[PDB]
Amino acid sequence: DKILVLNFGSQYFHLIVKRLNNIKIFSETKDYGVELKDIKDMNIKGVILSGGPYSVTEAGSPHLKKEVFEYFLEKKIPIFGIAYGMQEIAVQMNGEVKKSKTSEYGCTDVNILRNDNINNITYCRNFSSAMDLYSNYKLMNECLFENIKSDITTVWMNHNDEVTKIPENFYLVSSSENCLICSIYNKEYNIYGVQYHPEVYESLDGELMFYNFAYNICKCKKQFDPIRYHELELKNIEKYKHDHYVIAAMSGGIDSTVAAAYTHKIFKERFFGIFIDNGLLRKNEAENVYTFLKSTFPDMNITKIDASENFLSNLQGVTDPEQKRKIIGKLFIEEFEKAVNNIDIDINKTFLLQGTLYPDIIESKCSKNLSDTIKTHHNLKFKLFEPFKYLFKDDVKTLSRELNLPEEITNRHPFPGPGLAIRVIGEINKHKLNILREVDDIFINDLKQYGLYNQISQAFAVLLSYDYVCVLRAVKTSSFMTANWYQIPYDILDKITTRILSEVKGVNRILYDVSSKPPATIEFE
Amino acid sequence: DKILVLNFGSQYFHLIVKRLNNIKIFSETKDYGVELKDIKDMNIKGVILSGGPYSVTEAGSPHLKKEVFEYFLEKKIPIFGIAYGMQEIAVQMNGEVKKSKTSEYGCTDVNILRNDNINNITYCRNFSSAMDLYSNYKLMNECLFENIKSDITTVWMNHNDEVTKIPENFYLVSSSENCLICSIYNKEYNIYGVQYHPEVYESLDGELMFYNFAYNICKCKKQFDPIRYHELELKNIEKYKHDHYVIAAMSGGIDSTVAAAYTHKIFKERFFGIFIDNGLLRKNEAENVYTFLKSTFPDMNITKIDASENFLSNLQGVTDPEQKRKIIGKLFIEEFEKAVNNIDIDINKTFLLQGTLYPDIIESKCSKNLSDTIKTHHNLKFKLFEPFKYLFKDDVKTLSRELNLPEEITNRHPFPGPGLAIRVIGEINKHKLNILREVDDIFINDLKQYGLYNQISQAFAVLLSYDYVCVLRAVKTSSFMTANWYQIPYDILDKITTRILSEVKGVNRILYDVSSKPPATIEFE
Ligand SMILES: NC(=O)CC[C@H](N)C(=O)O
Ligand SMILES: NC(=O)CC[C@H](N)C(=O)O
């Protein structure tokens, strides 16, 4: 089952192939000007159209023959157009493509469209209501996007021309802030179209859309099941389990606690657990995180650090978020090294274990904004060990269940690097932290009691013997650069605010953030 | 139909009579030790028990005979106990009254109880859940409180002993923060009990509960209908319509615009309208308020003032709310006098028209907190003219409809004295006002568009080319010292926040206040 791929001049053409090789599907390359005789004798159950530096309507521009396109639809050959490829599918099928209003380059989020998802569009006036615009186009109920987490997906943009008129009898599937008709799907001829480049590493769900295309749509008979795994990288390092050591910043997050779980199984004695209580943690996490780790991992060597006093004194006076982040970052590297320099081992023979995920890499790769980022800490040059570099968050959740670990660790909302520092606005103090912790803990303990925690991506509190003002944050994260605010039922919401202003001393006003990202952010500072 | 009133030593006993005389019901006085023979020959269709400096259970304390109480219930004579009077009704009917945990003195709000109203109680742990406590007592569906605006009512407290055990087969009707079983009602014997003193001027709904008691419960045949009126005071001043003049601070509020409407009819030429644009007003109120007034009152002499520049320069640097209020107040008296000193008339022969209401007097009388107060401005000694001194807000709404005035003026939320000054936190600027006005106007224009404005007591925005944070305020006011926060439907709420962060330049975050009063307030500063 060879899937045919055609080149139009895309600088990402090899990535299109490399994607197929990672998902272990056979592939054969031909250009955009192949005579039918060369692809008729071959068994082909799919077609892919690449991008190209040319304009889809200008003179001398690369295209396909008229009779070769009428060869696919009759033989039931699913088509897939990328960027310039999508534009080619439009032009040949009575669709109009002209120069766009504004170009698109870099990381970009696109909205999957149902008749339900239409409400999630804010940019209606960019090209002026929600349904007032999508009444001109078709929709449906969700097949390319089978098994996708959210209705958003981060993709790689590189183009200046977009589609202007949807081809004959097509469904509009996706839209972006600067490209309305971004993705299409013909149910009749089983054709898919996309303006972005899913093959690019920056595109998060690129391999997922390819797996659904060739397997679940083109019906290729697999023949290659295992392939890429979290254990493949682990089975590799097994050949170093006596030569070197492995250290890890035990933070308490699911990413660090289930990465250390396997790396302790390999380096049973050569593994060092380093947990640092910066004093910027939540209520009782100074002990509960440590106590839990020692209990669940008895054989694991754990070194607990209390540099909280070194964090407070160094943050005194500092009110600017950037310098507050700069201090915490440049101080975390110190207390970590100092801890490593308490356990005498070969520095040139040791690994740096970092539960790093595929989305974490791109979030750092595609430099957009790093205020809401979680993995912050990502004079000693280590050989970095990131076995989950090609893995997802939902994946890690599955492994943590296989290890008989509780659900408490897999439901735990992602707690960022700088901690409560960017949650205490202005001057930071040990007193303000105490007040914020009392408020934050009540807020969380209730969300658990009434069962809303699991339905929220991330929830916390912000502080704005003086009486202070508190803000309650609760979001529904779709991508690392876009999120909504969770709509807490009022009856439940009322109880929390009632139980905070009554019990906690030092607060007389509670606010709830009702601003989305963009243009806002998850974290205040 | 004489209503019997009994004295126990209350210092407010005459007020109990004075209330009856205002509602024009016949009354006859006897003490707490009347022999039955004196009240049997008299036609009595009601009974009232007053307070007293004594304790209801101590030795030598004033009480009633056992056979005189068994005289009412058989002859169908409705009873009404006040403070010590209520405590007497309890003791004689197998109810227990002991010294309270904490005393109560001054203005106090009490909660009317249904099975619905139980959720409005926050002080459950003062004597620990909502229904967990009121499951021991009885409730019902709302007769003493016929035609009452809210489920709260401001009353006058003076006592140290409260009831501890509800008398045989009684309904619990009201509760306070320091007195659980505050008001009772026996459906069997038609008996009512109250810990507070409704006869006191400070008690807002004192005359209302008396009108329902004697008329709607005791069935007295009226014989006196007109009595107190808004026109009685107006018909009085008619004897000065040539001797003196009348000036009024035209603000734009319903209280000033429908008070000037009548006073212009009397002093057709001797009346002066003074509207001051302090620059702290809402969007376009600098002209819309003036233009409306001149149009609806063509014959009325109106003097428009633009002291906005005198308000800004004087408020520069001032960030403390108290001094911000102190400046505005001490400056409003200046621009008003200066305006009066532009119209040469006899200063010793002029009236000061002030649309003042009965609740406004008590709000100032019972000095609790004046941050949320509306009537703020309440070297020239005038003869004050307050014809609505004994009138309610709901009353004024009825008169403004009789004058064929639009609903726009009767739905207009009460806009306070200091204006947008206490809504711009910190340094005040002409720039910040522009940004706040754009946000506030959008917020209001939407509440009108989606029809929530009328269901809200008061709604506005607060600001916290720099990007600033905005807070949206929307409350359900029950009393001038207690209020909830309105629960805006999310779909509607989402649109507003979406339309502010997109259209308004200078804001990147929107918050919504979810704190009630107490312990918070309506206004930030
Ligand atoms: N990457 C691309 O395909 C961009 C090519 C060309 N600029 C276009 O408008 O499509
Ligand atoms: N005003 C009153 O009736 C108070 C009297 C007395 N102190 C009591 O506890 O009732």
Numbering used by the authors:
A (entry chain A), B (entry chain A): 7 to 133, 137 to 151, 154 to 389, 397 to 482, 495 to 555
Can I see the authors' text?
GMP synthesis proceeds through two steps, the first being the conversion of IMP to xanthine monophosphate (XMP) catalysed by IMP dehydrogenase followed by GMPS (guanosine 5′-monophosphate synthetase; EC 6.3.5.2) converting XMP to GMP4. GMPS is a class-I (trpG-type) amidotransferase in which the catalytic reaction occurs in two physically distant domains, a GATase (glutamine amidotransferase) domain and an ATPPase (ATP pyrophosphatase) domain5. Hydrolysis of glutamine to glutamate and ammonia occurs in the GATase domain, whereas formation of the intermediate AMP-XMP from ATP and XMP occurs in the ATPPase domain. Ammonia generated in the GATase domain attacks the intermediate to generate GMP.
The glutamine-bound C89A mutant is the first GMPS structure harbouring an original conformation, in which the GATase domain (1–236) has undergone an important reorientation as compared with that seen for the native enzyme. This glutamine-bound structure corresponds to a pre-catalytic state which to the best of our knowledge has never been observed before for this enzyme family. In the structure of PfGMPS_C89A/Gln, glutamine interacts with catalytic site residues Gln93, Asn169, Asn171 and Asp172. This is the first time that a glutamine co-substrate has been observed in a GMPS structure. In this orientation, glutamine is within hydrogen-bonding distance (3.3 Å) of the catalytic residue Cys/Ala89, the ensemble mimicking the pre-catalytic state of the GATase domain. Upon superposition of the PfGMPS- (conformational state I) and PfGMPS_C89A/Gln (conformational state II) dimer structures, the two ATPPase domains remain invariant, whereas the two GATase domains differ by an 85° rotation and a 3 Å translation when going from states I to II. This 85° GATase domain rotation locked by a disulfide bond between Cys113 and Cys377 implies a linker conformational change. Electron density is present for residues 376–389 and 397–401, while in the full-length form and in other reported structures (except HsGMPS) the lid is not visible in the electron density. Transition to conformational state II results in loop 376–401 (lid) being deeply buried into the ATPPase domain. Ultimately, after the conformational change to state II, the helix 371–375 bending would be at a maximum and the lid would be at the bottom of the ATPPase domain, displacing the products of the reaction. This hypothesis is reinforced by Asp371 interacting with Lys386 in PfGMPS_C89A/Gln, thereby blocking the enzyme in an inactive conformation.
